[PDB]
Amino acid sequence: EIKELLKLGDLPTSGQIRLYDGRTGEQFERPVTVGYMYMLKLNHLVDDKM
Amino acid sequence: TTIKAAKKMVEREEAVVWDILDEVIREHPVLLNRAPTLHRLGIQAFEPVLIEGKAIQLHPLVCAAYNADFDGDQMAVHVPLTLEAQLEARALMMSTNNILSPANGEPIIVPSQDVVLGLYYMTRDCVNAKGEGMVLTGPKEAERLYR
Amino acid sequence: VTEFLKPRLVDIEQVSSTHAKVTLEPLERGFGHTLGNALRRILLSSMPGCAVTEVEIDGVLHEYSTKEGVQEDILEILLNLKGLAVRVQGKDEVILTLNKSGIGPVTAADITHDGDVEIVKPQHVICHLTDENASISMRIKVQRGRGYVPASTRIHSEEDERPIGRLLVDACYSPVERIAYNVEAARVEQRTDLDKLVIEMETNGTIDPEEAIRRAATILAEQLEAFVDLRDVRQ
Amino acid sequence: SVTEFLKPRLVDIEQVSSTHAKVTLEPLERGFGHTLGNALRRILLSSMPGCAVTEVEIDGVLHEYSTKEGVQEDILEILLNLKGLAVRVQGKDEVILTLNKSGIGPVTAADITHDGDVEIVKPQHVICHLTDENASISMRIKVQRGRGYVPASTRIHSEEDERPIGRLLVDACYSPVERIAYNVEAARVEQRTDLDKLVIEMETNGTIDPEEAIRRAATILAEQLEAFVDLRDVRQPEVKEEKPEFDPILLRPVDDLELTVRSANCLKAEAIHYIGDLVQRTEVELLKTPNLGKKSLTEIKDVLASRGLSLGMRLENWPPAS
Amino acid sequence: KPLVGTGMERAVAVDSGVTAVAKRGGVVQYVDASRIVIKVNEDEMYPGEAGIDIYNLTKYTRSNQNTCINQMPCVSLGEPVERGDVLADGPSTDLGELALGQNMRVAFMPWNGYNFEDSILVSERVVQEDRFTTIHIQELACVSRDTKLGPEEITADIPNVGEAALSKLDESGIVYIGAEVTGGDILVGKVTPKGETQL
Amino acid sequence: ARVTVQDAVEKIGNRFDLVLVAARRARQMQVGGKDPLVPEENDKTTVIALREIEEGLINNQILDVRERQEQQEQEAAEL
RNA sequence: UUAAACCGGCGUGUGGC
Ligand SMILES: [Mg+2]
């Protein structure tokens, strides 16, 4: 079902697209997988422990 | 002239205090420390370089010696403050002088997952690829052809 | 202020006179990476020069061979010829002969001294020879190309089916042997971090490394000349 | 040819929308495709002249952590929408824009008091929502032209610029480009083979011009490349005896010593801008200077001699910087 | 809103008491960033002394963990609401749905060792778009202790202090609402006598 | 800079007498105001003392010899 | 005698490694 949802989104079924380097600008072999993750900022900011 | 003027200048955060800081931390090692200290390697000496921010930069390869991942661990740092202490941290506490485990003969500077994974992917050979069956004249030629 | 920063280099180390290390400091937040990468990619492929591309031994006509007179196989011969850097004058393509007998190693100094070419290292050993009654000769044709042209792609086109009955060799028109740029953090009065570039390069000796860097910079500037401010200041 | 190949040229600024634009550079010989593509992409995404908002001031609110009776969103969301607002200034580098609005409705970019040198790239950008009949907002917006991206914290320069309570600081994020994609293709050369045409598309704020931005990026790249186009051993450490003893700071004009403007023009009546000449000017030329009476002379004596300097000191090395 | 979810997010957001849930259905009359006016429908209206409801949202105030808690309205004028509907998306909520943090583009590859053990690499686009910038409220409380010799006062006449430190103070002795402070600066003028008796 | 000091220990054994000799050498360098026997690269006194030991110029024995020479100089100066 | 300079103890709870 994730596969068919990706298909409806026109995005690759495997989730691995070919990425180009940010600095050298070359093509990365073995395409990396990329997505949208849900990340959280924890209550351990550096400005309170330093 | 007086120490009060120097204190006011260092409290004002001028630019003239910075090059002095580069001069005084050029060859002044500090003492890196872990909160739980199990073995002698939990304490080490390191040459600091000034980095912006509020976090301590540490060599990844020595992390395996501290047994302290990056999941929020807080490490401490002290100063030798004394000639004897500085040369002692250099001689008997430098990370370069402590590379072999004090328990057995295996090196404690064993590489970690990232570099070993990169090297394994690099040296893992396949059956057919670009530039197969050719001849190379040297490692520099190989690097040039790969780039 | 729309005005950027220009670096003030600190060191041009010329150790071994053929493997140099140029440092540059400082650059903008991300200019070091792009500058190093562009210069590297230009010097690797798009850097014209001259090198051997055709080899023809009048005794053997194959890469694979069991040829006496030399204790090294033909593949070693081709590998030694591949590294033979020669600087050519206005001529774009020329052949040379290496008729020589003797005892020990046939080297590059035994090449017929033409007036259109110049060997950068006559002391370059080519092929060790049998110590008696061994006289092997070969011709080598060089070309003025763009960069690294491998064997597979080249032999597929220049000779439709190998009509002349010829041999091949990996053409390396790029005078640089290796190059690597490393960026580090450098400080100015109080700014966060600036790119300090360190380019360590090594060429075939036909041109100095700083000369190769200068040539790459000039070729990139001439490529960009179509869009670069149309002028010094536009106003 | 075999050497000294030809150079590319710009042949298209085809725009599919107000922001999404496409250019095609051609022709690139070989390997210059990825090289120039990555180089231009990095130069564009890294630094381009931007003119986003940097400082705001609304009469009713004192700090961004407050509210206002009548607006739907908080001051923080207003600052968000202002940061999201893009604009193009042409004449000056910094400008102040006034926005006055009243009555129920979505307050957008079109409602601001525009000018001639200032052009809103898109007026449909909503700023806030007034949700009351007798609800009005009057705000001042500082928009300055700069390079790169700077937060609101480090932008402080003194301890008096933020003393006005209404002066709220938003982190100036001015970068006209948003994303720069590129690719290489087989150029349709008249008589040749495998020539690379570089197609570069840019999704931007619509403020900067596509061709102008590409050309500016090329300018920056060539200016940086000029550093080592004639590289040689060049050094600028003062490894010598240059240590001077003249008045170190008194070479800048009088006006930066925290004094009024009338005394500034008064010191200009004697044609003395830099105190490097006034250090050779004792107190006998103070009350002879036109219109130096009681309070102006008081300020002159106070803000000058209290900073460690003395009014009138004999020296002979201010010209040669020694 | 979380791109991926579990269906439970629509419950913990509503069942919690952090958001302003509508007690009586009806229409919304006056939407403001501080208050919400709810005109009750006539069927649910009381037969006597009835009227409308006024929900006073809480502003930025300090919590037990020095975290600001703020309620932001999420309705417009004339929009009808029912009993049990949310009226103001509180902290970590998105249209009646509990949303912890921001969704972001993530790749899984070692980038120059900058993700060595577990470290995270973030781009300047995150901090430029004002994505993770949080707000913290800290409480500073001074007490006027009473001694056996005179009481404690907040007179703004501070001795042996520069005028630059007295600039932020008002006539009373408490700094105005909206004046930032960086270093140790007087914001309460609690100067009191010490001189003993028997004068 | 000086990355490692193992070559300072291979010639001055036990890795602890090196500590003592470096302490005394750098103490005579900082306050005693002696001259570094090698042209330094603008680094700390500790590391120049260690490097001067590294060039085979200073050990404990020649340190005692220099102390005896300074004592003789003091005897001659007191006269 | 006078002058000058300077001038967290305890428990509790929570959380993290
Ligand atoms: Mg841990």
mmCIF file of C-alpha atoms in Angstrom, chain D residues 91-298:
data_model
loop_
_atom_site.group_PDB
_atom_site.id
_atom_site.type_symbol
_atom_site.label_atom_id
_atom_site.label_comp_id
_atom_site.label_asym_id
_atom_site.label_seq_id
_atom_site.Cartn_x
_atom_site.Cartn_y
_atom_site.Cartn_z
ATOM 1 C CA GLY D 91 16.943 53.581 -6.282
ATOM 2 C CA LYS D 92 18.234 53.328 -2.721
ATOM 3 C CA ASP D 93 19.625 50.429 -0.690
ATOM 4 C CA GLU D 94 17.501 50.923 2.444
ATOM 5 C CA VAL D 95 13.967 52.296 2.647
ATOM 6 C CA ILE D 96 11.033 52.661 5.048
ATOM 7 C CA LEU D 97 7.535 51.577 4.004
ATOM 8 C CA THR D 98 4.355 52.633 5.799
ATOM 9 C CA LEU D 99 1.313 50.352 5.975
ATOM 10 C CA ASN D 100 -2.000 51.764 7.208
ATOM 11 C CA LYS D 101 -5.176 49.695 7.198
ATOM 12 C CA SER D 102 -8.608 49.772 8.813
ATOM 13 C CA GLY D 103 -11.830 47.792 8.754
ATOM 14 C CA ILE D 104 -12.538 44.080 8.528
ATOM 15 C CA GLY D 105 -10.592 42.217 5.871
ATOM 16 C CA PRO D 106 -7.371 40.428 4.928
ATOM 17 C CA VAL D 107 -4.521 42.939 5.008
ATOM 18 C CA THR D 108 -2.125 41.991 2.200
ATOM 19 C CA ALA D 109 0.958 43.499 0.573
ATOM 20 C CA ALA D 110 -1.079 45.703 -1.781
ATOM 21 C CA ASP D 111 -2.384 47.800 1.132
ATOM 22 C CA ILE D 112 1.040 49.292 1.908
ATOM 23 C CA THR D 113 1.934 52.817 0.793
ATOM 24 C CA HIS D 114 4.147 51.935 -2.153
ATOM 25 C CA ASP D 115 6.640 54.236 -3.868
ATOM 26 C CA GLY D 116 8.356 54.520 -7.236
ATOM 27 C CA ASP D 117 11.721 52.993 -6.354
ATOM 28 C CA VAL D 118 9.981 50.207 -4.383
ATOM 29 C CA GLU D 119 7.962 47.508 -6.157
ATOM 30 C CA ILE D 120 6.028 44.678 -4.522
ATOM 31 C CA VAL D 121 6.688 41.464 -6.434
ATOM 32 C CA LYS D 122 3.263 40.021 -5.585
ATOM 33 C CA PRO D 123 0.411 41.865 -3.831
ATOM 34 C CA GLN D 124 -1.677 38.765 -3.061
ATOM 35 C CA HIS D 125 0.651 37.835 -0.176
ATOM 36 C CA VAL D 126 -1.587 38.144 2.880
ATOM 37 C CA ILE D 127 0.004 39.859 5.883
ATOM 38 C CA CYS D 128 -2.723 39.652 8.537
ATOM 39 C CA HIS D 129 -6.498 39.753 9.048
ATOM 40 C CA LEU D 130 -8.370 42.626 10.684
ATOM 41 C CA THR D 131 -11.435 41.137 12.383
ATOM 42 C CA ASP D 132 -13.223 44.213 13.730
ATOM 43 C CA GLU D 133 -14.952 47.247 12.255
ATOM 44 C CA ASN D 134 -13.052 49.881 14.257
ATOM 45 C CA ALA D 135 -9.754 47.990 14.025
ATOM 46 C CA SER D 136 -6.766 49.724 12.454
ATOM 47 C CA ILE D 137 -3.051 49.014 12.119
ATOM 48 C CA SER D 138 -0.255 51.463 11.282
ATOM 49 C CA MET D 139 3.219 49.998 10.876
ATOM 50 C CA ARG D 140 6.655 51.038 9.645
ATOM 51 C CA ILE D 141 8.795 48.482 7.815
ATOM 52 C CA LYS D 142 12.535 48.822 7.241
ATOM 53 C CA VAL D 143 13.737 47.095 4.068
ATOM 54 C CA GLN D 144 17.472 47.149 3.349
ATOM 55 C CA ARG D 145 19.548 45.573 0.594
ATOM 56 C CA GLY D 146 22.278 43.162 1.630
ATOM 57 C CA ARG D 147 24.137 39.944 0.827
ATOM 58 C CA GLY D 148 23.525 36.503 2.296
ATOM 59 C CA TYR D 149 21.528 35.772 5.448
ATOM 60 C CA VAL D 150 21.961 37.258 8.922
ATOM 61 C CA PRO D 151 19.940 36.476 12.074
ATOM 62 C CA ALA D 152 18.332 39.114 14.260
ATOM 63 C CA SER D 153 20.577 38.405 17.260
ATOM 64 C CA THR D 154 24.037 39.131 15.840
ATOM 65 C CA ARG D 155 22.770 42.133 13.851
ATOM 66 C CA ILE D 156 23.065 44.344 16.951
ATOM 67 C CA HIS D 157 25.813 46.954 16.625
ATOM 68 C CA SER D 158 25.422 49.192 19.699
ATOM 69 C CA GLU D 159 23.404 49.524 22.913
ATOM 70 C CA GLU D 160 21.097 52.328 21.735
ATOM 71 C CA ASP D 161 19.639 51.302 18.351
ATOM 72 C CA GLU D 162 17.068 49.002 19.986
ATOM 73 C CA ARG D 163 16.181 51.477 22.747
ATOM 74 C CA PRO D 164 12.954 52.427 20.890
ATOM 75 C CA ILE D 165 10.582 49.778 22.201
ATOM 76 C CA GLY D 166 8.496 49.617 19.024
ATOM 77 C CA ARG D 167 11.530 48.669 16.909
ATOM 78 C CA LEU D 168 11.025 44.924 16.478
ATOM 79 C CA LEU D 169 13.807 42.905 14.857
ATOM 80 C CA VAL D 170 13.078 40.130 12.357
ATOM 81 C CA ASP D 171 15.948 37.945 11.170
ATOM 82 C CA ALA D 172 16.748 39.306 7.713
ATOM 83 C CA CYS D 173 16.554 36.312 5.360
ATOM 84 C CA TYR D 174 17.069 37.894 1.936
ATOM 85 C CA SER D 175 17.818 35.410 -0.841
ATOM 86 C CA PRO D 176 15.870 35.929 -4.076
ATOM 87 C CA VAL D 177 16.537 32.393 -5.310
ATOM 88 C CA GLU D 178 14.814 29.441 -3.653
ATOM 89 C CA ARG D 179 15.994 26.447 -5.685
ATOM 90 C CA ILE D 180 18.347 26.104 -8.659
ATOM 91 C CA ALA D 181 18.032 22.959 -10.770
ATOM 92 C CA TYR D 182 20.141 22.265 -13.835
ATOM 93 C CA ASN D 183 20.903 19.579 -16.385
ATOM 94 C CA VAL D 184 22.995 18.997 -19.490
ATOM 95 C CA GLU D 185 21.713 17.888 -22.879
ATOM 96 C CA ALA D 186 22.939 17.282 -26.415
ATOM 97 C CA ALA D 187 23.235 20.765 -27.900
ATOM 98 C CA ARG D 188 21.976 21.208 -31.467
ATOM 99 C CA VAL D 189 25.287 22.417 -32.855
ATOM 100 C CA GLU D 190 25.279 23.293 -36.554
ATOM 101 C CA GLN D 191 28.197 20.977 -37.452
ATOM 102 C CA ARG D 192 29.651 18.978 -34.545
ATOM 103 C CA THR D 193 28.791 16.122 -32.178
ATOM 104 C CA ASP D 194 28.096 15.654 -28.446
ATOM 105 C CA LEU D 195 28.012 19.310 -27.442
ATOM 106 C CA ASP D 196 26.556 20.128 -24.031
ATOM 107 C CA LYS D 197 23.773 22.674 -23.591
ATOM 108 C CA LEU D 198 23.189 23.559 -19.934
ATOM 109 C CA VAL D 199 19.538 24.150 -19.022
ATOM 110 C CA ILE D 200 19.208 25.879 -15.642
ATOM 111 C CA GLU D 201 15.798 26.430 -14.073
ATOM 112 C CA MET D 202 15.390 28.658 -11.023
ATOM 113 C CA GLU D 203 12.440 28.855 -8.660
ATOM 114 C CA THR D 204 12.865 32.253 -7.022
ATOM 115 C CA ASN D 205 11.042 35.051 -5.195
ATOM 116 C CA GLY D 206 10.389 36.855 -8.486
ATOM 117 C CA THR D 207 12.370 39.837 -7.186
ATOM 118 C CA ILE D 208 15.651 39.346 -9.042
ATOM 119 C CA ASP D 209 15.812 39.059 -12.821
ATOM 120 C CA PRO D 210 16.840 35.604 -14.095
ATOM 121 C CA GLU D 211 19.391 36.696 -16.691
ATOM 122 C CA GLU D 212 20.617 39.457 -14.381
ATOM 123 C CA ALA D 213 21.060 36.912 -11.584
ATOM 124 C CA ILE D 214 22.919 34.454 -13.829
ATOM 125 C CA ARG D 215 25.203 37.234 -15.042
ATOM 126 C CA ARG D 216 25.826 38.481 -11.496
ATOM 127 C CA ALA D 217 26.746 34.953 -10.428
ATOM 128 C CA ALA D 218 29.191 34.727 -13.331
ATOM 129 C CA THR D 219 30.678 38.073 -12.265
ATOM 130 C CA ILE D 220 31.184 36.838 -8.707
ATOM 131 C CA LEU D 221 32.737 33.583 -9.914
ATOM 132 C CA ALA D 222 35.178 35.347 -12.242
ATOM 133 C CA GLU D 223 36.075 37.917 -9.581
ATOM 134 C CA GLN D 224 36.904 35.095 -7.175
ATOM 135 C CA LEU D 225 38.816 33.239 -9.902
ATOM 136 C CA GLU D 226 40.898 36.356 -10.596
ATOM 137 C CA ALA D 227 42.626 35.666 -7.264
ATOM 138 C CA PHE D 228 44.707 32.813 -8.712
ATOM 139 C CA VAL D 229 44.538 33.737 -12.392
ATOM 140 C CA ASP D 230 47.916 35.428 -11.783
ATOM 141 C CA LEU D 231 48.744 33.832 -8.443
ATOM 142 C CA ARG D 232 52.137 34.397 -6.835
ATOM 143 C CA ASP D 233 53.679 34.619 -3.380
ATOM 144 C CA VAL D 234 51.742 37.587 -1.984
ATOM 145 C CA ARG D 235 51.709 38.403 1.723
ATOM 146 C CA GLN D 236 50.245 41.085 3.988
ATOM 147 C CA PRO D 237 51.784 40.602 7.442
ATOM 148 C CA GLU D 238 53.571 43.714 8.727
ATOM 149 C CA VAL D 239 56.972 42.040 9.085
ATOM 150 C CA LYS D 240 58.789 45.379 9.339
ATOM 151 C CA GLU D 241 58.938 48.579 11.411
ATOM 152 C CA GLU D 242 55.727 50.490 10.704
ATOM 153 C CA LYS D 243 54.720 51.027 14.376
ATOM 154 C CA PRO D 244 53.656 54.694 14.497
ATOM 155 C CA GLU D 245 53.033 57.165 17.325
ATOM 156 C CA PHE D 246 50.597 59.650 15.750
ATOM 157 C CA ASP D 247 46.996 60.032 16.931
ATOM 158 C CA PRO D 248 45.697 56.515 16.202
ATOM 159 C CA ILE D 249 41.921 57.015 16.140
ATOM 160 C CA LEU D 250 41.750 60.790 15.582
ATOM 161 C CA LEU D 251 42.049 60.454 11.785
ATOM 162 C CA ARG D 252 38.318 59.789 11.409
ATOM 163 C CA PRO D 253 35.978 62.826 11.398
ATOM 164 C CA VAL D 254 34.673 64.681 14.445
ATOM 165 C CA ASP D 255 31.087 63.457 14.057
ATOM 166 C CA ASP D 256 31.728 59.953 15.449
ATOM 167 C CA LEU D 257 32.503 61.229 18.975
ATOM 168 C CA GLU D 258 28.811 61.241 20.017
ATOM 169 C CA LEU D 259 28.065 64.960 19.725
ATOM 170 C CA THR D 260 25.467 67.178 18.068
ATOM 171 C CA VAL D 261 25.233 68.332 14.445
ATOM 172 C CA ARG D 262 25.479 72.077 15.060
ATOM 173 C CA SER D 263 28.926 71.572 16.585
ATOM 174 C CA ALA D 264 29.700 69.249 13.662
ATOM 175 C CA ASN D 265 28.996 71.967 11.092
ATOM 176 C CA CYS D 266 30.760 74.444 13.387
ATOM 177 C CA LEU D 267 33.948 72.371 13.243
ATOM 178 C CA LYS D 268 33.374 72.392 9.473
ATOM 179 C CA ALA D 269 33.326 76.202 9.490
ATOM 180 C CA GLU D 270 37.034 75.985 10.347
ATOM 181 C CA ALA D 271 37.294 73.238 7.680
ATOM 182 C CA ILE D 272 38.405 70.689 10.290
ATOM 183 C CA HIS D 273 36.704 67.343 9.707
ATOM 184 C CA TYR D 274 39.478 65.067 10.965
ATOM 185 C CA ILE D 275 41.014 65.855 14.343
ATOM 186 C CA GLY D 276 44.306 64.734 12.808
ATOM 187 C CA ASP D 277 44.474 68.442 11.991
ATOM 188 C CA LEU D 278 42.655 69.501 15.183
ATOM 189 C CA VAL D 279 45.234 67.700 17.327
ATOM 190 C CA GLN D 280 47.438 70.533 16.046
ATOM 191 C CA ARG D 281 44.783 72.987 17.268
ATOM 192 C CA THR D 282 44.886 74.040 20.923
ATOM 193 C CA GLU D 283 42.135 75.742 22.938
ATOM 194 C CA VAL D 284 43.037 79.192 21.556
ATOM 195 C CA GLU D 285 41.073 78.338 18.387
ATOM 196 C CA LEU D 286 37.911 77.174 20.188
ATOM 197 C CA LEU D 287 36.056 80.380 21.065
ATOM 198 C CA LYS D 288 37.496 82.007 17.935
ATOM 199 C CA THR D 289 35.785 79.276 15.920
ATOM 200 C CA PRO D 290 32.447 80.825 14.859
ATOM 201 C CA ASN D 291 29.495 80.245 17.195
ATOM 202 C CA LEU D 292 31.144 78.230 19.982
ATOM 203 C CA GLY D 293 29.453 79.596 23.081
ATOM 204 C CA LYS D 294 28.279 77.964 26.302
ATOM 205 C CA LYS D 295 26.644 74.583 25.625
ATOM 206 C CA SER D 296 28.218 73.739 22.261
ATOM 207 C CA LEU D 297 31.638 74.522 23.732
ATOM 208 C CA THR D 298 30.621 72.473 26.781
#
